[PDB]
Every structure is written in C-alpha cells, then in structure tokens.
Design a binder for these strands. Sequence first.
RNA 1: UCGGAGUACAAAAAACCCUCCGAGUGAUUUUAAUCUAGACAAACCAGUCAAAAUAACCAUAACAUCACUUAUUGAUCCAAAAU
RNA 2: GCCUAACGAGCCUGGUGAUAGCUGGUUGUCCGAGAAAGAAUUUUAGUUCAACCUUAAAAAUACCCCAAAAACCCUAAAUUCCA
RNA 3: GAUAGAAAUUUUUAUCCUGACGCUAUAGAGAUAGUACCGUAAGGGAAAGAUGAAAGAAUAAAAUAAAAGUAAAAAAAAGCAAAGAUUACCCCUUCUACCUUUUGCAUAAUGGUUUAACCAGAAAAAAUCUAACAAAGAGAACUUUAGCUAGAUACCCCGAAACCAG
Lengths: 105, 140, 196, 95, 55, 97, 288, 118
Amino acid sequence: TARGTASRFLTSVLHNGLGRYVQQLQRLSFSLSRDAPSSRGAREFVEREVTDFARRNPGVVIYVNPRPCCVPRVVAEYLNGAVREESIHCKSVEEIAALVQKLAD
Amino acid sequence: LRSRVTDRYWRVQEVLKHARHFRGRKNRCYRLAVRAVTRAFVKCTRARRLKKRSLRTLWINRITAASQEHGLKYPAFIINLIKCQVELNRKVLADLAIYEPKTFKSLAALAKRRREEGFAAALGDGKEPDGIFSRVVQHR
Amino acid sequence: VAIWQKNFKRISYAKTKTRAEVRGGGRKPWVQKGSGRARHGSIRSPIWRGGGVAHGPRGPTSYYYMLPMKVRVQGLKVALTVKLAQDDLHIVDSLELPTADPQYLIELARYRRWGDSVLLVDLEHEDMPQNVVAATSGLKTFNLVPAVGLNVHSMLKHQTLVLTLPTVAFLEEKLLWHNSRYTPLYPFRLPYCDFP
Amino acid sequence: VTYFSSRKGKRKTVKAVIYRFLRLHSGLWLRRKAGYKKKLWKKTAARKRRLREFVFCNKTQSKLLDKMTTSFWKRRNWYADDPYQKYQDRTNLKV
Amino acid sequence: KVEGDIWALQKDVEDFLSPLLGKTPVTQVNEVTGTLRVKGYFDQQLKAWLLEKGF
Amino acid sequence: FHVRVTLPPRKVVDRWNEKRAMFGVYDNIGILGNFEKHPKELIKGPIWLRGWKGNELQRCIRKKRMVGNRMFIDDLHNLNKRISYLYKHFNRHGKYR
Amino acid sequence: GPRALDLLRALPRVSLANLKPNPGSRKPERRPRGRRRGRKCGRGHKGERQRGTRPRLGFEGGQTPFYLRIPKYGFNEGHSFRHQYQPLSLNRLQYLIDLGRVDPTQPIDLTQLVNGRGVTIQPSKRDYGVQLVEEGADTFKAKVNIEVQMASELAIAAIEKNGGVVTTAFYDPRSLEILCKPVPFFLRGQPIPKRMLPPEALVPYYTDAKNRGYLADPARFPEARLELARKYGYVLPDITKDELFKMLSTRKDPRQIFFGLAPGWVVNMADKKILKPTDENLLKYYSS
Amino acid sequence: KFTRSRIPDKVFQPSPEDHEKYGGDPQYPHKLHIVTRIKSTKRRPYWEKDIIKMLGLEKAHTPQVHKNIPSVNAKLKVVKHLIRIKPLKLPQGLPTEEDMANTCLKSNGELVVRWLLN
RNA sequence: UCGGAGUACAAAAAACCCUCCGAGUGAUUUUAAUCUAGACAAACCAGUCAAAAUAACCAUAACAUCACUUAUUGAUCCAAAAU
RNA sequence: GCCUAACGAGCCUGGUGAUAGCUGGUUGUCCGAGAAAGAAUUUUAGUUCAACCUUAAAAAUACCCCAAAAACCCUAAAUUCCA
RNA sequence: GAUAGAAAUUUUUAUCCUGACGCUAUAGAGAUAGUACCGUAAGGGAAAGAUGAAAGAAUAAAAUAAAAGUAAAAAAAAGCAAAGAUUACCCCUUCUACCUUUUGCAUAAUGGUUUAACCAGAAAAAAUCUAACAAAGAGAACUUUAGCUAGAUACCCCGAAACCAG
Ligand SMILES: Nc1nc2c(ncn2[C@@H]2O[C@H](COP(=O)(O)O)[C@@H](O)[C@H]2O)c(=O)[nH]1
Ligand SMILES: [Mg+2]
Ligand SMILES: [Mg+2]
Ligand SMILES: [Mg+2]
Ligand SMILES: [Mg+2]
Ligand SMILES: [Mg+2]
Ligand SMILES: [Mg+2]
Ligand SMILES: [Mg+2]
Ligand SMILES: [Mg+2]
Ligand SMILES: [Mg+2]
Ligand SMILES: [Mg+2]
Ligand SMILES: [Mg+2]
Ligand SMILES: [Mg+2]
Ligand SMILES: [Mg+2]
Ligand SMILES: [Mg+2]
Ligand SMILES: [Mg+2]
Ligand SMILES: [Mg+2]
Ligand SMILES: [Mg+2]
Ligand SMILES: [Mg+2]
Ligand SMILES: [Mg+2]
Ligand SMILES: [Mg+2]
Ligand SMILES: [Mg+2]
Ligand SMILES: [Mg+2]
Ligand SMILES: [Mg+2]
Ligand SMILES: [Mg+2]
Ligand SMILES: [Mg+2]
Ligand SMILES: [Mg+2]
Ligand SMILES: [Mg+2]
Ligand SMILES: [Mg+2]
Ligand SMILES: [Mg+2]
Ligand SMILES: [Mg+2]
Ligand SMILES: [Mg+2]
Ligand SMILES: [Mg+2]
Ligand SMILES: [Mg+2]
Ligand SMILES: [Mg+2]
Ligand SMILES: [Mg+2]
Ligand SMILES: [Mg+2]
Ligand SMILES: [Mg+2]
Ligand SMILES: [Mg+2]
C-alpha cells in the first residue's frame, strides 16, 4: 500500500551517468557453508562463476566466507553505504547468478 | 504427538504491520485488522485501475483550460491536431501547456489553421483546392 | 526397505481421553432455554477447557506391515551393490586383530581412509575372535555384527562395510536362493526336499 | 451393509442379493424378471416369455451389488456340470 | 528383465513393429527399472521376435 | 502469542549411542537365517499388537478379545463404550457410504 | 551393462540423508485446511450428506429397493455343497513335463502336481481335486500315469493314444487336504486315516469303466479302451510289453491315500521312521 | 417462443444502386471475406455463440479471412448482426513465398505485399 | 392409479386444486405354442413390437375379435394348491 | 394442586459421545475445470437413479448442416433427420 | 428386511534384550484434591508453582518492557474511516463491513467488545499411481483366462424435548 509505506522521487546517486557511469555496487560478501546441503548452490556458484563475475566487474570487492552457517547469505554494500542482505538458501546456480547480476545492476 | 503453533507472533505481525497507520482499534486488534487490511488491498487494486482514468481526466481538463485560454475548444483542438498527423497524447499535451506555453500556442495556431482549411474545403466542395496543412503524408 | 525397517517395529504409546473418558460431565450445566447463554451438554466436550480431545491419538497404534520377501532381498542386494560401487565395501579374511586396543582400529581406519563409521560383519556370533570383540566393544562408530544382522539401515548408516570371506560366501548363497525358488506352500521352516 | 463387523472386524454381505442374484466372474450380474409368477392367466404369451427370460444388470446396479457382496462371491468357481461355466468369461469385447 | 541399452531395445522394437501397424508404436522406457512398455497387445509377436533373436 | 525470551538448552543428541547404532540390526533374521523366526517376534509391545495392524475398531475388538479378561472395571467399561461408538459411527455415519 | 554403477562413482555417498521415493508412488494426503478445502470441507450444504446420516447402500429413499423387488430364485442355492474340480489342461500338463516340474517316469498324483505347482487345490472352498480337460489334446506327446478325480472323454482318448494310464479316484475332504499338504499332516502327529468311499451321487461315475473309475471292474477296461480307440481312429498301444509297465500299472488301494503308505501308520519325520500299529482291533479298523 | 430466424431470399438480392453505393463489382463477385466481430456474444443465443466460435471470431476487433462460398455464407448470414464483412482486395496480387514476411493488412482492406521495405 | 382430446397449431417430452370424456371390464369363438435376429420406450422396476426356424389345422391365415380399444390394473416377501 | 425456588409429573447417577432429514460452526497459499433440477419416494426441510459436471484412459467422428423426406378438415414462429 | 452369525477341521518354541517419532501447569489423572465450595441427601466439583550456587547475598542483581486496557499525548465541517495520492494530517475523487442462510442482504435477517490459550474429516471393498515377481503371486490357510503381493490416496464438532434402571 502506497499510503502505508514510504515514498521517494526518482533520482540518481551523485548524478550518475551524466559525465561518466560509475557502478554503484561496492562490495559483495558471500557467507556460505562447506558441508550444509542448503549451501550447495552457493558452493557451485563459487566454484564456477564467481571468478567470471569478479573479472567482469572490477569495481566491486568480492569476499567469500565458508563458515558453519545454516542459511547462506549475500551482502551487497553500495557506494551510498546502503546494505542489502539477501538469502541464497537452496537456490540453483542460475538463480544465484541472476540475483548477483541484479544486485550489481 | 501434540503440535502447537510457535510462530503465531510473526503470523500476527505480518498482518498488523499493514494496519499501523489506521484509526481506532483496527491498528491493534487482529480481528478488526484482518478485515481492514483486506479492504485496504482491494481498494489499492481498484484505485490502481482508476488512477489512469483520473490522470487522463486531469490532463484533459488542463488541455481544455489551455485551449480555451488560446480561444479554442478542446474537441476542435484535438481533432485538428490529429488531422495534422501530430500524434501527441494528452499527457505530453498537458506538459507542453504547463511548461511550454509558446509551443502550445503554436500547436493551437496550427489546429485553428487546420480547422479553417477544413471549413473552407467543406464550403467550397471543390476537389482541386487543397489546403497547405491539409495534405496527408504517407509512410516512407 | 529403509522406511520399512524404521517403521514396522513402531508402536506409538500415545493416547488421549475423549469426552466419554473424562471424569465428570454427566449433566447439563444449565437449562437449554432462558439462561441467555450458549447451549451445552456435557461439561467435558472438546469445546470446554478441561474437556476431552476430539480425535487425538487413540491407544497404542501398531504401524506394522511386512514387505514382500523378494523386495527385501533385492533391497539387501542393492545396498551391497551400491556399497561396492561407491568404494565403501572392503573384504577381509578371518577378521583377526593383533591387539584388543580400540585405538589400534582407529589408527588402522584413519590410515586406510575407510571413513568415520565402520561396520564389521562376521559369519557367526560365537565364532568372532576375542581380540576384535574387545576392540569393538569400546567403540561407537565401529560396530560389529554377525552375518544374520546385516541390513539396509545399518549399511546406509555406516560409511564403510567390512566383510570376511565366509561372510561373503554366506551372503551370496543366502541371497541367490530367491532368484530361482518356488513360492512357499508352507513356511520354509518346515522340511523341504532341498531346503533345511 | 456392515462395513466393520463387531466380532471379526470384517465386512459383511447382505443375503438377499445372493438369494435373488447371480454374478458371473466377468463382472455381470444375472437376475430374473420381476412378476414372472404373478397372474399368468392375465398375460399374453409374448409377455410371459419375456418375464421368463433371464436378464442382466447395468453398471450402477452391478457396482451396487458388488458393494453389498463380499469377495467370496466374486471368486472363480469350477462347478461340476455348471450351466453358466460357458458364460463365466467374456469374449470379443472391443473397448 | 532388460539389461543393457534399453534405448537400443526400444529402437529395435519400434522398427520391428512399424510395418505391422503402419506407424511408429507408442513406447515408454523405464531405465531405472529396465522396462519397455508398448501401447497395445503385441505379446505373442514380441515373444516370437525374442525367440528368433535368441533370448 | 508470547514467545520465550531465552535460548533453550541445546540438546546434545548423539547419533552413535547403543540403540541408534544397533537399530533394527536383526530385521533380516529370517532372510539371512534359514527361516525359523519371523520379524514379528522382534516386535516388543502390547500382547494384542505384536505383528498386527488395524484401525481403531479392530484394535479395540482385538484388545477386548485378547486381554479383556484382565482389564480393570472402568477400563473394560470404557473399552465396551468405545467399541459401541466406533461400531455405530463406522457402520452408520460417513459420506461415501 | 549397468552404467548406473559407473555413474555412482561420481555421485556422493548414498546415505539416509538423501533418499527419495519414486515420483507418483505416494499421492499426498489433503486435509480440510485453507480457503479451497475448508468451508464445508467437501461435504456439501445441509441435509443428510453434510451431517453424515445417509441411509444404507440399498436404500432408494423409501422406494422399494431394486435388490428387494427382484424375486428370489435359486442361483447360489446349495453352492457350499456343489463339488468343485480345478481344471488341468493337457497343454499345461505337457508344459510342466517339458519344463521338468513333473516327471513322467513316475506315477503322477495330486501331491506331485501340487509340488510342481501346476494346480492349486483349496479343500475348504469345496474343491474335490483336479479334472482333466482337452484344451491341449492336439499337441500332447507325453506318456504318463495320470491320476485325477474327473477326466474328459477326449482327454482320456488323447492320453491313451500316447500310451498312458488314466484313473479317476475319489477323495473325501480330509484325505484331500492330506494329499495336498502331506508334510503338515506328517507334522500333525496323527495316524494316516482311511479314504472315504464316494457318495451315492458319485458311485456310478467311479464304478464305470468308461470313466476309468478306480472302483470299476478291471475286466471291462480293455473293452472301453478299444471302443475309445475305434471311435477316435488310433491304434491302441501295446502297453503290456512296455518297459515301464510296472509304473503304468501301479495303483492305489481305494482305502489308500499315498503310494506305499497304509492307513494307521505314523510317519516320524524327525527320526525318519514309520510306526505301524499291531493291535488286532486297530488293524481291523484301518483295513476295513 | 424465441427460436432461430429464417431470412427470406429477397433480403440477399442486391439492387443495381447497391453496387455503386458499397463499391462492389456488378459483374464479378469478390473472392475472400474479411470478417471482424464487433459485438459480443453475450445476451445472444447459444447457436450464435457456437457459430462465432467455429468461425474463429472469438476475439473481437481481429480480422479473419474466409472464403466467399455459400457454405460459410450461411453461417455469416446467421451471425451477420455481430460482424463486419469486407472484401479482401489485392492490389499487388497474392503474396509470394519471398514476400510472406513483409506483408500487412490495412484497415481499408487491401493486403499490401511489400510493407515498409528497407 | 391408468387411458383419450385441448393446453402442447408442424419429431419426441412437457406442469397447474387447468377444461372435458372415460377404466378398475363384458359378449363371442378362431382357446390364440416353443425358440430367437434386430428394434421402440425407459432413472430403475416394469411395459411394447418382431424376421427366420420348429409340432397340429387350409397343404394359401392363425396378430383371438368387438364395445372411440387406447385404460380394464399391483412388486418382493409370505400363505395356500398338486408342482 | 403440592412432593426442597423450573412437577402434565422430583432430583442425581448410569445407559450416554442417546438420537436428530433441524440450526450453528468447520482453521495455510496459488492454479485448472466447474454444475439451477426428469422419475420414484408417509415424499416434496431428505435420499436413490437419470441428465449435466470433475479426474484419468481408449478410440472416431462430433456440432453448423443445402436438397430430398415427416397425415389425414384450416393452420404461425419454427422443429426432426441429413451431405 | 435392517441385520445377526457359528461349528467340524487347522496354526501358535522357553527367559533377558522395556521403554516411548506420549503431555509439560487451559496439556497430562478431576487432583497441590475428591480438598475448598455448591446441595437436606444421593451427588457435582475447582483454580491456584515459577529469582538465584547462596535470600545464614531484600542500603537485593540481571534479562521482554513485545497482546488486549490505559498514560505519556482529549477533539476542529464530510461521512464502513480506507485507497489514489500529495510539498502537506485532514480538506479533493472512488468504494452499500465480514461470515452464515437465501432467488436475492449495506440491509433494519443471524453471530461477534477485544486479547491470549484450547475447539471441528476418521475407515482402503471395488478403483488410480508406484514398485516386486510374473502363468503365477503371497514368509500357511487364498486369489488367479495377466494376474497376485506391498505401499500411498476416504469418509467432522456442538445442541434437544425425550426413554429405561437404580
Ligand atoms: N443448484 C445450484 N445451485 C447453485 C448453482 N450455482 C450457484 N448455486 C448456489 O448459489 C449460491 C451462490 O450464488 P452465486 O454466487 O452463484 O450467485 C450458493 O448457494 C450456490 O450453491 C447451480 O448451478 N446449481
Ligand atoms: Mg491494464
Ligand atoms: Mg460420562
Ligand atoms: Mg443423564
Ligand atoms: Mg447430549
Ligand atoms: Mg481441571
Ligand atoms: Mg484433559
Ligand atoms: Mg479428498
Ligand atoms: Mg485424511
Ligand atoms: Mg471449500
Ligand atoms: Mg469461513
Ligand atoms: Mg437442503
Ligand atoms: Mg452450515
Ligand atoms: Mg411408501
Ligand atoms: Mg482354486
Ligand atoms: Mg431410444
Ligand atoms: Mg415366422
Ligand atoms: Mg424441585
Ligand atoms: Mg449429535
Ligand atoms: Mg425432510
Ligand atoms: Mg478458473
Ligand atoms: Mg448421483
Ligand atoms: Mg433440410
Ligand atoms: Mg451429419
Ligand atoms: Mg421394511
Ligand atoms: Mg490441570
Ligand atoms: Mg499494549
Ligand atoms: Mg473525506
Ligand atoms: Mg445491493
Ligand atoms: Mg444454497
Ligand atoms: Mg426469503
Ligand atoms: Mg430492510
Ligand atoms: Mg433482510
Ligand atoms: Mg432466521
Ligand atoms: Mg446485521
Ligand atoms: Mg453467523
Ligand atoms: Mg449481537
Ligand atoms: Mg484395495
Ligand atoms: Mg420406546
């Protein structure tokens, strides 16, 4: 509901895209597990295509943490200081790739 | 094996978060909130459907205002702008009326000229006289 | 086979009193009409506070069913086959040990990379050597069972299976008998022409 | 019909169905036409013959009688000189 | 009781049954079980075919 | 819907105790033992439920037939009333008929 | 062959943590919870259906029921006393002989057929043994000493063509159970009983040489065999000068259940021994 | 009682002035119909609904090409009050196999063969 | 409860405490059988037709007829006869 | 009438979870298709069939349907069956 | 008719291996208790506990300050109280509360002040799906003219006036 939630006007960060386009994704931290069955998609993503994403986007610092966690998470920190925390719990590699690309965009 | 619900707090809060800004006991009591939240959502969908109609009516009113300010009626202005193959919708026309007064006056002058050419052609009933702005340009 | 093994032995000892078994509730708490409140019969109805359970669990319930014998034999065969295929089956001879130290078995297993859990199967209960008996009596993940105690549940529970040569021959003979056998006219415990 | 008996816990059968009906193993039920012994002096020869003839039952009645009877009456019987042994089976049914 | 290339068996069965029906027979392959399921009664014909093939 | 404010003591359950390690070890006693004993004999429980399964009415009937001569007065009365209620409900109530 | 075994090498360990039933094997149960499956929960509106007080199956709402307006006629009248005989095709007998289930070198009996699983006899269901049918008489090429309870005329002709012996005998239900399952009877611990004579309805069948009755006059057997051979246009084999004439002419006493064994004997299978009564009264009772 | 309607034959006998009024050839009838459903089938009988369904006119304001044979003319007569019928005109001939993907149907009824070339 | 006409104008069906006729059988002799294709009608139960083939009469009919002929009728169970 | 504040027949306990064709209630999300009544019935406050409808499976024709065809005193809209 | 229902005849090998895919103070016994209390009596019949190693550590210490109800902080034209929105709370525009029962309810037809905890679909004969073996299937008794064995799919809660016995 629009009346129940907040609102804002359309705007760009620091006049992005005017003189040059600066990617707003600053860092991407994956927290996964090396043996939990729910982290299998995250493990396959890290094995296969985290390096390709890092090479495609050199302006974002990617951290990977294998720790004993039950739910795997991804934390996207932007140039504004905004933090977006998403759960990659039980998702396919394609779903992880789509979510990561959406966060980058 | 006795099973009881343990997440009822979150089940209640998921509904109560959408009614915090209500008035009366509907923002507190769950029984009175579920009915009010459902009505709020139904009204949200209906008003989403009606927002386009409301905004189109507002744009039409603003176009009528500007055209009458230029000494022209809205139906004549629209039909002559269409006859001039100028396919600008009501939103753009209202934007021009508010923020581009000279451009809107030029459009009104063009519409009035096309109306005059149409009236002259209808009065003459002659095929050989063709208006300068009454010519139709096909796709190229 | 694993679900059957988990379930046929189950007897749930859960029982709740219905409205006919709760102590009181023998009379109408108030008259049907005029009182202005809701109509009720027994005060032990499931609606009431101390009333009985509407459906609940009813007495000891036995979830006992018996899978067909050929299906169970095929399950045993498939468990053995997957254990061999995934390099988790090891054949030894005579199941003898030098010492009765469980730590010796621990070192041997971690040296041979057998796995965290090992199940050792011997031919007969009374013929198991005292050395391995004492070694496995003090271990949790190293479990020693006779040939007749082999089953799919434990085979899947333990990462590594260890079989002796007589145990392998016994299992082979016992499992290959059902592929070319008649249906039992009477239970096979009774005498037959070619069966004990 | 008693779906669960009080002694054995089994399913019972109504004896009227077996007393006035016959089931072939193919699933068909055979019955006698009602009124075939009533007021024969008042009926034409063709009507009397039609009443005397045996008749079958449709799907609804067959399923009803199957529900009323138990599995002992749907078994395969090999009687000595059975009149309906030739009719026990169905042939050339293209469905 | 089919062991091996059940897909090859299905191909052979459909090739054998195509002239008899005038069209490719409808078949289902259960590879985890090792079963071929053809639409229609061809039991005697398939028995004779397997006898001739040597099974 | 008030929920507890403290962490419950985490149960340290082990998967390698005696019962869990020897669960159903002789489930194939017959098949691998030159048949003398059915897996029925390994079932421990009430006398009227060893190697048998039925719905509530059948279970009550079997209990009354087997151990009904040793039940207490109120227990036997409750069993009889439950048998009567189950008979009436199963033979006279329902939708599919 | 089994490429799944090689595929399993790459796959992780098969344990209890990764187990799945076949898809479609277990249809999920559905409970009356939610918007769709609530609100009368598939029972309907008011009446007897929603309250679960419907009448019985045969009830038609007060109309005279269909299963009650039909007149009673004898269809299953006396069904529990009609004699039943399991059919055994000559085709099935030849199939059993070819596959080795029954040996033609020995006299074929009901016990031998049951052991070879060719027939299944349920004496509690009023079965009185096995009858012989002619469904495979054209391709029957075996010489056996068959022993049945009823035999078709064409089946008898087909067997005599190859040169066997057909004998029809009677077995009361007790002796029939004993013949079908001798080992349970031997573990029962009771002496072998005498074989009851057929009732008056079956005496003519078993005392005629045309049916090869076991109580029939042996002097009339060759006449019946010759008549059969002349009717069906085949030469009657010289059975007397056959190598297996003893096996073809072996017979059971009309009071005898098994071959060789006698009524009153106790077969102690644990010690592999036979106990025979010697009392005069017992012997007279068992041989009478 | 409300039933179907039989249209008399004199209804479908065109006047000599009708050809000039509607722009039709007095000699050669046209070959193909362009039929476009305008009105809804609601509050109309089930036979009219079924005729609309079998004519492929389920969706409104979408032209469909049909033959000019009496077999379909009968159904078009049955549901003539819910449709607009025009003749299909081909100034550039039938579309060839090399011009299938570059054609369009104008609102005035001529199917152009080359539509927005290049 | 059953039948005919109108309602219900032209295949079938079609309701009202709608409008009118009727039936709960008589008279007479041609005393009118068995078996079986295929059909009508029909929720079911019931109701209707019927070719060919069989034994007796012309060696060429047998559908009993008439009274508006359409209605003139009652299921199981159970009781009685002589089955 | 009165028989411990309710007597056309006290109260308590047990049968008893009496029985209700009658009223009320029947608890997660999303998706697909989707029904207004002919006959019996102490039956019209209900059930059981039929016709519709749902879920699966076999097939091949299914609706629209020009001629031609369907009664005798007069008879409309139109019906049935069909390429 | 609803329904009731055997028998003749068969099978059953000693002991430990016993605890819990039962509840955790509206649950589990009614129970802290057949006690208070209610009836002349037979009889009915409850609710009520929460700190800490130490309270012989109460100038006592830490976690939630999360239900309904209030206070902090009474209200300013207009309207099922919300939505579209808006620089902006209202002011503007639009929507005849929700279940149940009905041909049809905003209906002035029923139900509910609110919160918390309890409160209502249960059965495998025939069938469908999956799997084992297959002219045979089933770990005994049966069914079998592709069938037999196993598993999963299914059928509520409250309410009378009454009747009988002591
Ligand atoms: N008998 C019958 N009742 C219907 C049908 N359609 C709707 N109803 C009933 O009508 C009511 C709901 O009305 P609706 O929402 O259909 O306008 C409900 O009581 C429903 O059972 C139908 O096709 N047949
Ligand atoms: Mg839209
Ligand atoms: Mg009580
Ligand atoms: Mg009472
Ligand atoms: Mg009550
Ligand atoms: Mg209490
Ligand atoms: Mg309780
Ligand atoms: Mg269901
Ligand atoms: Mg269920
Ligand atoms: Mg529903
Ligand atoms: Mg509701
Ligand atoms: Mg109703
Ligand atoms: Mg209701
Ligand atoms: Mg009546
Ligand atoms: Mg049998
Ligand atoms: Mg018809
Ligand atoms: Mg004739
Ligand atoms: Mg009093
Ligand atoms: Mg009730
Ligand atoms: Mg009623
Ligand atoms: Mg839908
Ligand atoms: Mg129905
Ligand atoms: Mg016509
Ligand atoms: Mg046609
Ligand atoms: Mg009665
Ligand atoms: Mg308590
Ligand atoms: Mg509060
Ligand atoms: Mg307002
Ligand atoms: Mg309204
Ligand atoms: Mg309704
Ligand atoms: Mg009303
Ligand atoms: Mg009103
Ligand atoms: Mg009202
Ligand atoms: Mg009311
Ligand atoms: Mg109201
Ligand atoms: Mg209500
Ligand atoms: Mg109220
Ligand atoms: Mg079943
Ligand atoms: Mg009475």
